[PDB]
Amino acid sequence: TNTEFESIESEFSEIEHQIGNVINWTKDSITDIWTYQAELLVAMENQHTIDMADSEM
Amino acid sequence: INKISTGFTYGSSINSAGTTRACMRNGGNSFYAELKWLVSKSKGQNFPQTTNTYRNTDTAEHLIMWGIHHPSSTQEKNDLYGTQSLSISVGSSTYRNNFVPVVGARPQVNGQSGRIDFHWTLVQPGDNITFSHNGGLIAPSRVSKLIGRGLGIQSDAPIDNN
Amino acid sequence: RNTDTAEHLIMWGIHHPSSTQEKNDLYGTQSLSISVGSSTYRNNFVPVVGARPQ
Ligand SMILES: *[C@@H]1O[C@H](CO)[C@@H](O[C@@H]2O[C@H](CO)[C@@H](O[C@@H]3O[C@H](CO)[C@@H](O)[C@H](O)[C@@H]3O)[C@H](O)[C@H]2NC(C)=O)[C@H](O)[C@H]1NC(C)=O
Ligand SMILES: *[C@@H]1O[C@H](CO)[C@@H](O[C@@H]2O[C@H](CO)[C@@H](O)[C@H](O)[C@H]2NC(C)=O)[C@H](O)[C@H]1NC(C)=O
Predict the structure, then answer these.
(1) B154 has a chain A CB within 8 A of its CB
(2) Residue-by-residue DSSP string for B22-56
(3) What is the Å distance from ligand 1's center to A11 Cα?
(4) Chains that touch B (3 or more CB pairs under 8 A)
(5) How far is CA B99 from CA B37, C10, C50, in A?
(6) What is the C-alpha to C-alpha distance for residues C35 and C37, in angstroms, rounded to an integer?
(7) d(CA A37, CA A54)
């Protein structure tokens, strides 16, 4: 469901402190969902593959 | 980007060919390619008061930008503009603001001890934007328009075409 | 004076004449200036004349 993403902060200039923190908070809080979501999601695919293949025998 | 000229015209007593050493081109004094630095024709003479307007007729809004001058010492504003008080009034059907040059000492940057600060606004189609300036204005001579959608990359890696 | 149990919203406005002939009529020839003040909010304004589209 690809959606293009832009830049919301400058990599060479500076940002205001008040708004920079809010941007920082959201990013670190959104990176914590993908990391947690990916670990468990894969573990539930490794788990099923082992069980599935052993029933075929 | 697309550029559309403004068509501003100035009187006999206004010199729209001001140049500074810090913006060089071809080894000679120059200024910004799209902004005109108005000054008095003869040093010391009071700047005449003038009013200007931009008449939009295209189908889309244009981005108009201008600037104001902040001299470095009382000996300067008395020369470039004159002795009376300076004040600039702007007005459109949606944007109103007022500014005023103010002089004060500063550290030297490049070869100039003064400053110029820029503003901008969007002029909607079919509208008029007015510049009522007595002195210190750095008027535009072209107004840009932004068209289309694209992507903006902020990096320093070498370009690759294959 | 806000003699009540809850805070009230207060709103006001300032005039910006259209020509020197106008301010000299409505108000006068001296210099205009407005000063506001409370225990938390302090600000100052000033009418300024100019030219605008109608
Ligand atoms: C928002 O997040 C960014 C990224 O996490 C923060 O930028 C980082 O700011 C720290 C200082 O608070 C920088 O660390 C220092 O940088 C230089 C490296 O030469 C040096 O002074 C120190 O050794 C130290 O490492 C860090 O480099 C910087 N990160 C980037 C990528 O520029 C930012 O401060 C956060 N907050 C705000 C309000 O922007
Ligand atoms: C902007 O300026 C134009 C002129 O460049 C104004 O057009 C005039 O409008 C009046 C009032 O309706 C008409 O009587 C005139 O005939 C118009 N002049 C021309 C040359 O067509 C226009 O009103 C100004 N304001 C806006 C909002 O566009």
Answers:
(1) yes
(2) EEEETTEEE--TTEEE-EESSTTSPPPPEEEEEE-
(3) 11
(4) A, C
(5) 17, 28, 11
(6) 7
(7) 27
